[PDB]
# Entry
Amino acid sequence: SGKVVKFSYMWTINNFSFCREEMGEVIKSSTFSSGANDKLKWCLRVNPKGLDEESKDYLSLYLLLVSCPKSEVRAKFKFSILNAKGEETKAVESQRAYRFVQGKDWGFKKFIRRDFLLDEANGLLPDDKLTLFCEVSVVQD
Amino acid sequence: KADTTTP
# Structure
């Protein structure tokens, strides 16, 4: 029917300050999906120490379409970090919809400054846990 | 704006 499908996914990474990934290495989430009948599968991929030299001071975060879609997929997405109260903070939005094929990622190489994240005063790493939040809005042709 | 790591 082409009805827009909206859904959210959240993922807690333990001991985030101790992650050994260096620049360009990736942490992968589990797959997730809507509650509709299409059953597109998605995942998040995060670069704890940045994608590349340009984003070396940042956490980099991407949404990837994992499964094989039956028709064209266009999606909007927004990433945020949950504080200890579960409140969304430091949100970054795609604004426009992007075309996804199987294996395609879209995201922000400069999602958040690593030094801002690691400062306990900002409350984004309670108990050294990083909880990432993604909302996806998808239309299928 | 968003970036991608593929063509």
User: Anything to note?
Assistant: The interface with chain A takes residues 1-6 of chain B (CB under 8 Å). DSSP finds no helices and no strands in chain B.
